[PDB]
RNA sequence: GGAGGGGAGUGAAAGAGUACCUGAAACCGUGCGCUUACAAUCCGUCAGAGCCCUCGACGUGUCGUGGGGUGAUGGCGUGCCU
RNA sequence: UGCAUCCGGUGAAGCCGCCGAGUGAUCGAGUGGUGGAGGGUGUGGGAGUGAGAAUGCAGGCAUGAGUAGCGAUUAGGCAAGUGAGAACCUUGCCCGCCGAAAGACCAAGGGUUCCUGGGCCAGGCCAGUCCGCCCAGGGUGAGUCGGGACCUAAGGCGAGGCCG
RNA sequence: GGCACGCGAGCUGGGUUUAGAACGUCGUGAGACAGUUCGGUCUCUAUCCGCCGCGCGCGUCAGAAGCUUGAGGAAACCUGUC
RNA sequence: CGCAGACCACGGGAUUGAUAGACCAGACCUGGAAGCCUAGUAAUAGGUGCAGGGAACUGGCACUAACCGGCCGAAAACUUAC
């Protein structure tokens, strides 16, 4: 999606790409993760577009997801439950909740999770 | 460059008074019945039971 | 990058250049040992 | 006014950093000061909150005062003993590092609603 | 959580608590009074309004052989040593 | 300090004030607080007898300033746990880095830093429940390995000796 | 043309102006030469005034909000061919 | 949230909502995806098919987040003239 305006997350572009991939894998594996607020803000569109790929789940879309996810159990779950679950929802598959600041460095924390209402 | 002169007390105090902290604003919330104060930024998280109240 | 320092420890060299027997070999060394004894030094050599 | 006091001595924070947090709860009720310190994003808020809570407990227990009517009347931080360390620097010079502490005094008192 | 403290006790005294006789200055706070955001200040000194406190006398506030704190404002004023 | 007098646990000195005093250094056998054992006066005797400054010395503390910096050229993330407290400790799963090394083993040097259990004021450039930190206990097994008990090199010391 | 022949806590280091070496010349010599030749460490986290920008506070006799006048300042001002 | 920006400030939106993201479509950039079939010994080529992939731009769309919320913030009179 839109690239970051300022300096990249992990300290480099490659580290940011790996960070986003790992965070998306963790989110799809657990359903909700806790991290710094800017990380979740960057994670939302990335994970949502992966879910969009999984929604119209064909072989081509599967390979599109695998060229980012790298974990096969998460790919299977994404294409067997997560995709079908969001079949009739148009966008907004995740939500971000702000939580209390970290203690060691006063880093603003947030929780990103998949919506489960319908 | 180095300071040519020792600061007077008035100047030092007038500049030093600008290093201060602001009080966060607090709003009420009902978690497990009891009312307690929480920052508005964490209202939704408190209502979802994601913020530890001591 | 030549960062060799002056002190390179070696115990046999220390004993053979400053040890008790070397001090006792010569008159000046015996005077040194006597002076250190009179000063009250714990380590005479 | 009836009152109770509590003192934290040799707290390992500098007096100015404690004062920055103390300047937030002067003249406020004990409960609202405790909330402010709970949500203050400073490390000095934990010791100050502990002193204030200890003073409120002293007031409720030893003098039998109503906790709902307590007010942070007087609060200040003094300087404790400071320990001297050495930080080696470039080209053989050594600098002095000070490890400052502070004493924190709190006086709560009962005031009518 | 501890550290530390508050009651309670010991003690003639805890303004003697094993950070301990006495506890000065520099330095750092808190509270009260006066003052200060149109103003060019070797930071004082001489006049000095206003405000606050205090001692006497008479009524209810108003002077006095008064006293202290702060000082708007005006005049003067080129740090010490070598 | 000689001598003579006077005060003192019914509170000396020292310290902090108030109210006064002298032409000056200064004074207050005037007073209040603090304090807890020695002081005052007269008249003689003797000085380590008076600091504001020597880029003076020691201790304590300011200003700069809650400022600079927090030590490479690899990079961390999430879940669970422990716990008063977790970015840093534990476990798992990922991701990245070295790989004629940033892996493994010796010598010199160091000296108990090794292991187990405990701790968390000091130290660790933050925190720390962790640690090469602190405390207690434990741990190093040789006919053949490296040395001596075997041999000599350079060189050292050197019975007598020569020289001085 | 002035302004430290403006301007190195803004830069350079080619020249001049340390220590090495050589030529000519001078000196018995060590050496020397407003003679030449090759080489040769340019340190600093901005306290104050100044200046460029950006805020916070108070004031403008109630508290606010739109749109404005402008005392006073700053900028710009070149020129050719056909 | 922003094409406003070091911070701050400025500007816009806040369910009576298109502010940002997602989603749908377009514009644009790339240049013909995967899978399958066919041809070739193979390298590879052709069809399916202006394909597939995709950021910033434009328009739709409350799906997600703008929240059952806190703090500030309004008048001594008098004089004269009319």
From Swiss-Prot, chain A:
- Its Gene Ontology molecular function terms? structural constituent of ribosome
Question: What family is reported?
Answer: Belongs to the bacterial ribosomal protein bL17 family.
Task: State the GO CC annotations.
Answer: cytosolic large ribosomal subunit
Please report the organism this UniProt entry assigns to the protein: Mycolicibacterium smegmatis (strain ATCC 700084 / mc(2)155)
Q: Under which name does UniProt file this protein?
A: Large ribosomal subunit protein bL17
What portion of the full-length protein is represented by this chain? 2 to 119 of 199
User: Which keywords accompany this UniProt record?
Assistant: Ribonucleoprotein, Ribosomal protein
Q: Which terms under GO biological process does the entry name?
A: translation
How does the record describe its quaternary structure?
A: Part of the 50S ribosomal subunit. Contacts protein L32.
Swiss-Prot record, chain B:
Q: Which domain of life is it from?
A: Bacteria
Q: Name one GO biological process term.
A: translation
Select a single GO molecular function from the record's annotations and give it: structural constituent of ribosome
Q: Provide the protein name.
A: Large ribosomal subunit protein bL32
Q: Where is the composition biased (Basic residues)?
A: 1-18
Q: Which family does it belong to?
A: Belongs to the bacterial ribosomal protein bL32 family.
Entries under InterPro entries matching the protein: Ribosomal_bL32, Ribosomal_zn-bd
Swiss-Prot record, chain C:
InterPro entries assigned:
Ribosomal_bL34 (IPR000271), Ribosomal_bL34_CS (IPR020939)
Keyword Ribosomal protein set for record: yes
Query: How is this protein annotated for GO cellular component?
Result: ribonucleoprotein complex; ribosome
Classification via Gene3D superfamilies = 1.10.287.3980
Q: Which UniProt keywords apply?
A: Ribonucleoprotein, Ribosomal protein
Gene Ontology biological process terms in this record: translation
Q: Does the keyword DNA-binding apply?
A: no
PROSITE patterns documented for this protein? RIBOSOMAL_L34
Q: Pfam families, from UniProt?
A: Ribosomal_L34
GO MF assignments: structural constituent of ribosome
Entry-linked HAMAP family: Ribosomal_bL34
User: To which protein family does this belong?
Assistant: Belongs to the bacterial ribosomal protein bL34 family.
Cited PANTHER family: LARGE RIBOSOMAL SUBUNIT PROTEIN BL34M (PTHR14503:SF4), MITOCHONDRIAL RIBOSOMAL PROTEIN 34 FAMILY MEMBER (PTHR14503)
Specify the protein name: Large ribosomal subunit protein bL34
**Gene that this polypeptide is encoded by:** rpmH
UniProtKB/Swiss-Prot annotation, chain D:
List, in alphabetical order, the GO biological process terms annotated in this UniProt record: translation
Gene Ontology CC terms, in alphabetical order: cytosolic large ribosomal subunit
Keywords from UniProt, A to Z, are:
Ribonucleoprotein, Ribosomal protein, RNA-binding, rRNA-binding
State the source organism's domain of life: Bacteria
Q: Which GO terms describe its molecular function?
A: rRNA binding; structural constituent of ribosome
Give the protein's function: This protein binds specifically to 23S rRNA; its binding is stimulated by other ribosomal proteins, e.g. L4, L17, and L20. It is important during the early stages of 50S assembly. It makes multiple contacts with different domains of the 23S rRNA in the assembled 50S subunit and ribosome.
Please report which protein family the annotation says this sequence is part of: Belongs to the universal ribosomal protein uL22 family.
What is the protein's quaternary organization? Part of the 50S ribosomal subunit.
Q: What is this protein called?
A: Large ribosomal subunit protein uL22
Q: Which residues of the full protein are shown?
A: 7 to 119 of 153
